[PDB]
Design a protein around this ligand. Structure first.
Ligand SMILES: Nc1ccn([C@@H]2O[C@H](COP(=O)(O)OP(=O)(O)O)[C@@H](O)[C@H]2O)c(=O)n1
Ligand SMILES: Nc1ccn([C@@H]2O[C@H](COP(=O)(O)OP(=O)(O)O)[C@@H](O)[C@H]2O)c(=O)n1
Ligand SMILES: Nc1ccn([C@@H]2O[C@H](COP(=O)(O)OP(=O)(O)O)[C@@H](O)[C@H]2O)c(=O)n1
Ligand SMILES: Nc1ccn([C@@H]2O[C@H](COP(=O)(O)OP(=O)(O)O)[C@@H](O)[C@H]2O)c(=O)n1
Ligand SMILES: Nc1ccn([C@@H]2O[C@H](COP(=O)(O)OP(=O)(O)O)[C@@H](O)[C@H]2O)c(=O)n1
Ligand SMILES: Nc1ccn([C@@H]2O[C@H](COP(=O)(O)OP(=O)(O)O)[C@@H](O)[C@H]2O)c(=O)n1
Ligand SMILES: [Mg+2]
Ligand SMILES: [Mg+2]
Ligand SMILES: [Mg+2]
Ligand SMILES: [Mg+2]
Ligand SMILES: [Mg+2]
Ligand SMILES: [Mg+2]
Lengths: 132, 130, 130, 131, 132, 131
């Protein structure tokens, strides 16, 4: 159909703030299904640098990587119709109420969730987090 | 600015146990129930009348089948600017914060119908509540 | 163990916009709607029949007035052990975790009625859904 | 980027039992209460000061009568970009996802006031919290 | 009627954990009304010692007082039918799901909320927090 | 007083979209995920080990068929008095306020498993997390 898979990361601030189920539930309620999922008490720095490799020349790169290893993360592969753009829209931004970030986050770095933004992004990120 | 509008809660809402969730979003916005009917399975003729303006579309027959595939609730709601406001609450599967935006992810199975104009509202109310 | 039970959503639920909240608690426990009627104002006779076993109590006339003071919904619900389970969901105004426990705080205006036995369930269903 | 902004929970919130719902939406976006006052009935001159920019509008007197028709809460909230973000949370009755979008449907009774600029924030905080 | 007033404290752990509205909302949803309310960025130690004066000989007294001044608190007078025992039941305990503490707390000290337990308690505690 | 305990989210939770609802109730009581695994379909011998104390009951085979009928999540949770408190959160289908009390209505399909003693906790954690 329009069936896709996408990669979501629950960032360390979500564990710190006890918002993990809240974020996952918003995705669950829109009828997206968990296909694979891993809990990382602390993700390998190399995985993070790989994950954010397109950001490696940006001023925020090192602070971002520091944050992403500052606490646990969960990586999830979600499946559903048009999953990539729909889950991206769910993620939203800190300016847009109704979305995960819009309702729950208020920082340029600590924003609770990553979601893939393209088919190409999704394939690669999935490969990073679930090589098997 | 007081109006009445017709809402259908579609069979997917029953399947996914989202009936109260949908009604509650409308309730919390202060719209009031004026009348309501529960159909274990809506008569097909009522559905064909309801979606008559769609009868030539490729999706019509599949839509009718779906609408009869489980229960529905037909509700008449009342409040200021009801038609437009309840249409906004319904929303679409792209934009979060609305019923479809938060809860639906399909072009056919999208939980809720709401009248979109004064004419269609009068007509749809007359269909479900003659 | 499948049963049907009769639920009334009382006028205070409409007053306080708790209708969907109440229905949702029952929905989430996996009980299914079998039939449902909305009454903008219930006929007094139906109320007197409904609460007939109470007709000698000091509170009867005040109860009837209250039950007609705003809308009600009569619902037939179905599920395993429905009668007892929905009675437990209803609960009482003392113990939190239930509908009345979380949402109500009055001896009269307590949001919901649910049948309490197999006999009263059959009888109450026959009253609201003859 | 830390700012503070002034919020009023209007009497309709109390009437409809939506105080916690409104405060929780702001709480969940990580804004912090820096000070807060409950008024069973706000003195009218406070409301008139608060809405003084509106003193010449047709709705002015009716707005002030509404604002004294029940309790209100004045809150100072603190957090990053607070003035703009809480304004966005407030939203309007046409915008689902926001406080007014989900919960309000009136031009007057719309649940919440939020400061809209640094100037208005400073002034409004000084009105409700002269201290 | 059975109309009473009672005193509720929202303890510092509720601010720390962003559960303030959640606690207040549970009381609001049972139809109890706010009659008076004060925010304390930090409550005077003396008020706390007064508040918990019946506990002054207990091993935990000093640690409790330390905790109660460790962050903000809100004092609220609630009004409603049978408010004292009903709000007490809402408070509940960390062992009893369905109640505020039962759903949200898991510690003998940091338990989110205090509520008066008798008419005599309520009168006194109200006097402490709202002398006016 | 810190303990760890083992929780399974059973396949009915996935079917009815209640995974987050269940995990959120445990999260909101301040228990922490120490480790977690998702199984699109749990190997049957794992389920059989997990329920080995039940191997002689009439329902044993049907329970195991249910447990493999869909995904499950195994979680190790940590926090004060975790084994007993999460068991209480689990509750039963007769006790409103608990997970099963609010959400379940079946003897078999009841959404969640939680360890019931220190012995069973240690053993169950070793089954799902041999590491
Ligand atoms: N100045 C910045 C900008 C972004 N970031 C972080 O790194 C990611 C930047 O990616 P981005 O700008 O493509 O944002 P999204 O695509 O995640 O919305 C953000 O999600 C932030 O977590 C940061 O740490 N500092
Ligand atoms: N390709 C399609 C498009 C619409 N439909 C259904 O037809 C209904 C009416 O279509 P519409 O485009 O007017 O949608 P709305 O006005 O309900 O948003 C939709 O709500 C869908 O349930 C369908 O079954 N297949
Ligand atoms: N003093 C009273 C007692 C009960 N009632 C009403 O009468 C209904 C039936 O009374 P009941 O004692 O059988 O209560 P339930 O079985 O509904 O818990 C209650 O639900 C109240 O609404 C009343 O109006 N005044
Ligand atoms: N016709 C009107 C317009 C506004 N108002 C009230 O006056 C307040 C200030 O008006 P406004 O247009 O600046 O609205 P906001 O900035 O609060 O969105 C509104 O929030 C309404 O509560 C009114 O009572 N009657
Ligand atoms: N060992 C203890 C016991 C209680 N406490 C605290 O002080 C209060 C003790 O009061 P209590 O035993 O009467 O408990 P409640 O009446 O608050 O349920 C508790 O609410 C805890 O906040 C403590 O800090 N350490
Ligand atoms: N007749 C039964 C009883 C229990 N069971 C399942 O077996 C599990 C273990 O039974 P139990 O009586 O120890 O229940 P709990 O300790 O999980 O409450 C239950 O959680 C049910 O999922 C079943 O499938 N059929
Ligand atoms: Mg990006
Ligand atoms: Mg249309
Ligand atoms: Mg009775
Ligand atoms: Mg303005
Ligand atoms: Mg005590
Ligand atoms: Mg057992």
């Amino acid at each position: 159909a329009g069936l896709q898979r996408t990669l979501v990361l629950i960032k360390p601030d979500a564990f710190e703030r006890s918002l993990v189920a809240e974020i996952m539930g918003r995705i669950e309620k829109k009828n997206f299904k968990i296909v694979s999922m891993k809990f990382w008490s602390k993700a390998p720095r190399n995985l993070i640098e790989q994950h954010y490799k397109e950001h490696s020349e940006q001023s925020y790169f090192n602070d971002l990587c520091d944050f992403m290893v500052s606490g646990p993360i969960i990586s999830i592969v979600y499946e559903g119709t048009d999953a990539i753009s729909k889950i991206r829209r769910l993620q939203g931004n800190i300016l847009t109420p109704g979305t995960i970030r819009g309702d729950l986050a208020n920082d340029i770095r600590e924003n609770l969730i990553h979601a893939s933004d393209s088919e190409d992004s999704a394939v690669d990120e999935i490969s990073i987090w679930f090589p098997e």
